[PDB]
């Protein structure tokens, strides 16, 4: 006691940057009459310290003056969450009776001494969240009584010691955040009591040991973010107690093992980000407990099995970024608990099944870049729980106002590159949480419902490449949160509303290829974030307003194919960031202002088909201009 | 992906009172569907338009993970901290607009690797140091501005800076 307490008191002297408010103020009297009862963090047995608990004590120092020789009876040591720096001395293995060893969350460096292997009585080993480098010693396999080994979040290298098969009592192996190398020892598959194996986020090469079929007690197998190769061993199906299997972000090849159906407890399967090929085994429909099924970003082929209808508890089905084909079986959306259905980047065909939102809980549906056709199922129209909908790049058809209902929780929708006809329903206004409405390249006619502007939360609106008619109201100001407005390629007519002035958060304006007919608003001088403005192919009929030059941040400004007349104001020199200018196909007269030579950012100009004259100012843009950039003028020197 | 995780690092080191970065959903494959971010046909981020966003915080070294990023607009905010030298990893690059901020520290010499750079505006800041010689080797720099900043040393005309005007170096306390 007195020898132990004085030795601890000497070790405490090593501590640096220690405040008088520390918990170790109780270390005053070395007599057992205060050592074993009033000293914080120590607990004795038969008068001798067996327990040292100094977690989260803010101690700053090293274990160089740790009294190894003075504390024979230590069995519990937890020095985690402190500022200990240095190495792990081999003297740590001298604690014969030690059962619990925790040095996690520290600033330790160096290797793990093999002397830790002679801690025969050790049950738990925690060396977590440190910067220990080197290979795990083979001698760790000597810890026959160990049950949990956690050395993750470190800088460990080399292979896993195949002597780990000798750790029969091990139930929890945590080594994930590290740089372990080489193949997985086959002996690891022969741990009888193992329950959790987390080898993820490493540099592990080679195949997955077929011996893993013997782990009938394992419920968690995390080995993602590795360089594992070969094929998934079919003996994995014998892992009948598996709850979560994650091999994502690997270099696995070959087909999915049909033996995965035998695991009736598997609720999470993450096979994505790999190179598995072939067809989906119909036996995957027999994985009864499956909740999260992710096989995305692969090279799978063939159709989805109709057996997927037997997955009655599925919630996430990730099949995107693959080479699957054929029709969608109605059983895919059989689940009433389905919430996420990602299918983009595939080669599917045919109609959507009427079971699409059977349970009324679908949130995120993704169908981009496919060959779907036919109408939207009535179950999708009435499915109010949608959040993200992505129909982009298909051949969907039907009346756009008859296809979709109301969606109070809708956030993002993209129906671009489809064959939807009809006029826009005013039902979209009730999607008060919508921030991105993108419906470009369709066959939609009619006018924009005035209620669309009462959707104040919109930040991106894209109705481009359609046949929308009518004129934009001065109520356009109601969506001032917008930053991308793409209304180009339509039959919008009338004057451009002056309410565009008040959309100050606007970044990108595209009103081109339309039938706007009167003069540009002279009040458009307050767009401090606009870097794009395309007003080309219209009928604007007067002089360019001076207020346009007050938008300092334009990079591109296209006013081509118009009826603009008058002289090009010299105040365009103020646009210091302007890179592109297109004023072609107009009736602009006068001389090109020679103050344009001072616009260093300008690179591209087109002034063709106009009524200007005089020698052009000399800048980088005018010099490299081809002969097309000056065609059809009057007297350009 | 990689680019989306990189931009997510920025999102966590900035205070966003105006909810500008709200659309930046980390669980998406790419950040190309985010607002204020634009990609090219390859789904690589090429533009970040965060000017006048009332963003306070510190820059992030993950900004060098955007190989195709051409235009970086962080101007007109209350961002503090230093400029991480890792922005020199932006192989393709046109515009660096960091002006009108509260940035401090030196100007990293690693910006000389951005040989495609055309416009660099860092004025109205708290920058301190000297102009690297490396910035004279870009040969593509057209517009330059380091006004309203306490730097030191002489104006390096090493060849490229010969075309520039004292307005680029006004109120700089250089000479």
């Amino acid at each position: 006691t007195v020898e132990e307490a004085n030795a601890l008191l000497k070790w405490k002297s090593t501590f640096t940057n220690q405040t008088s408010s520390s918990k170790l103020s109780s270390w005053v009297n070395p007599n057992t009459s205060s050592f074993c009862t009033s000293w914080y963090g120590v607990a004795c047995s038969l008068g001798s310290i067996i327990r040292l608990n100094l977690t989260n004590t803010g101690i700053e120092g090293t274990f160089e003056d740790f009294p190894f020789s003075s504390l024979p009876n230590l069995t519990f040591v937890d020095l985690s969450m402190n500022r200990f720096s240095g190495t792990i001395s081999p003297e740590w293995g001298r604690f014969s009776k030690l059962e619990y060893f925790d040095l996690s969350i520290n600033q330790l460096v160096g290797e793990i001494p093999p002397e830790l292997g002679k801690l025969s009585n050790l049950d738990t080993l925690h060396l977590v969240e440190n910067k220990l480098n080197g290979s795990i010693p083979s001698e760790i396999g000597r810890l026959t009584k160990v049950t949990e080994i956690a050395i993750y979040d470190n800088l460990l290298t080399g292979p896993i010691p195949s002597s780990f098969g000798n750790l029969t009592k091990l139930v929890n192996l945590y080594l994930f955040i590290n740089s372990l190398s080489g193949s997985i020892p086959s002996e690891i598959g022969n741990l009888p009591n193992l329950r959790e194996l987390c080898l993820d986020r490493n540099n592990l090469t080679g195949k997955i040991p077929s011996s893993f079929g013997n782990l009938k007690n394992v419920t968690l197998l995390n080995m993602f973010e590795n360089q594992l190769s070969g094929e998934i061993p079919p003996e994995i199906g014998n892992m009948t107690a598996l709850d979560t299997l994650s091999l994502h972000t690997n270099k696995l090849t070959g087909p999915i093992p049909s033996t995965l159906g035998n695991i009736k407890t598997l609720a999470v399967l993450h096979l994505y980000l790999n190179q598995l090929n072939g067809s989906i085994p119909p036996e995957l429909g027999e994985m009864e407990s499956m909740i999260d099924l992710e096989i995305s970003e692969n090279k799978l082929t063939g159709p989805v099995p109709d057996s997927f209808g037997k997955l009655t508890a599925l919630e996430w089905l990730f099949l995107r970024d693959n080479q699957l084909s054929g029709p969608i079986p109605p059983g895919i959306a059989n689940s009433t608990e389905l919430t996420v259905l990602q299918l983009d980047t595939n080669n599917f065909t045919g109609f959507l099944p009427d079971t699409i939102c059977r349970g009324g809980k679908l949130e995120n549906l993704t169908l981009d870049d496919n060959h779907f056709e036919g109408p939207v199922p009535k179950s999708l129209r009435d499915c109010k729980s949608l959040i993200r909908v992505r129909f982009k790049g298909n051949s969907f058809s039907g009346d756009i106002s008859e296809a979709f209902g109301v969606y109070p929780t809708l956030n993002f929708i993209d129906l671009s590159n489809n064959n939807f006809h009809g006029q826009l329903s005013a039902n979209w206004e009730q999607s008060q949480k919508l921030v991105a409405f993108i419906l470009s390249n369709n066959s939609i006619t009619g006018a924009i419902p005035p209620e669309i502007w009462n959707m104040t939360q919109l930040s991106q609106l894209d109705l481009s490449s359609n046949r929308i008619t009518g004129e934009l109201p001065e109520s356009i100001s109601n969506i001032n949160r917008i930053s991308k407005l793409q209304l180009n390629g339509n039959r919008l007519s009338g004057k451009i509303p002056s309410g565009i002035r008040l959309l100050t958060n606007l970044e990108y304006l595209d009103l081109s290829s339309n039938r706007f007919s009167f003069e540009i608003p002279p009040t458009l001088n307050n767009l401090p974030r606009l870097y794009y403005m395309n007003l080309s192919r219209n009928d604007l009929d007067q002089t360019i307003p001076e207020g346009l030059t007050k938008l300092s941040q334009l990079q591109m400004l296209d006013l081509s194919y118009n009826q603009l007349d008058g002289e090009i104001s010299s105040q365009f020199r103020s646009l210091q960031n302007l890179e592109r200018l297109d004023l072609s196909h107009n009736n602009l007269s006068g001389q090109i202002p020679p103050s344009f030579k001072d616009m260093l950012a300008l690179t591209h100009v087109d002034v063709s088909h106009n009524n200007l004259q005089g020698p052009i100012p000399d800048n980088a843009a005018f010099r490299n201009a081809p002969p097309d950039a000056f065609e059809g003028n009057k007297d350009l020197c | 992906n990689a680019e989306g995780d990189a931009l997510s690092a920025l999102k966590n080191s900035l205070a966003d009172p105006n909810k500008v970065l709200q659309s930046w959903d980390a669980t998406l494959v790419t950040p190309c569907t985010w607002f204020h971010v634009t990609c090219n046909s390859d789904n690589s981020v090429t533009r970040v338009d965060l000017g006048n966003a009332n963003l306070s915080g510190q820059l992030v070294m993950q900004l060098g993970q955007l190989p195709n990023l051409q235009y970086l607009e962080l101007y007109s905010n209350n961002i503090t901290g230093t400029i991480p030298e890792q922005l020199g990893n932006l192989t393709e690059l046109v515009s660096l607009d960091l002006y009108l901020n509260n940035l401090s520290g030196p100007i990293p010499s690693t910006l000389g690797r951005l040989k495609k750079l055309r416009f660099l505006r860092l004025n109205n800041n708290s920058l301190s140091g000297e102009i690297p010689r490396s910035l004279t080797a870009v040969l593509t720099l057209q517009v330059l501005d380091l006004s309203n900043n306490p730097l030191t040393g002489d104006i390096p005309v090493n060849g490229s800076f010969s075309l520039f005007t004292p307005i680029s170096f006004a109120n700089t306390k250089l000479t």
Partner: peptide
């Protein structure tokens, strides 16, 4: 301390 690793969900479009 000790804790397991959580396989994070895949991405999305």
């Amino acid at each position: 301390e000790s804790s397991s690793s959580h396989s994070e969900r895949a991405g999305g479009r």
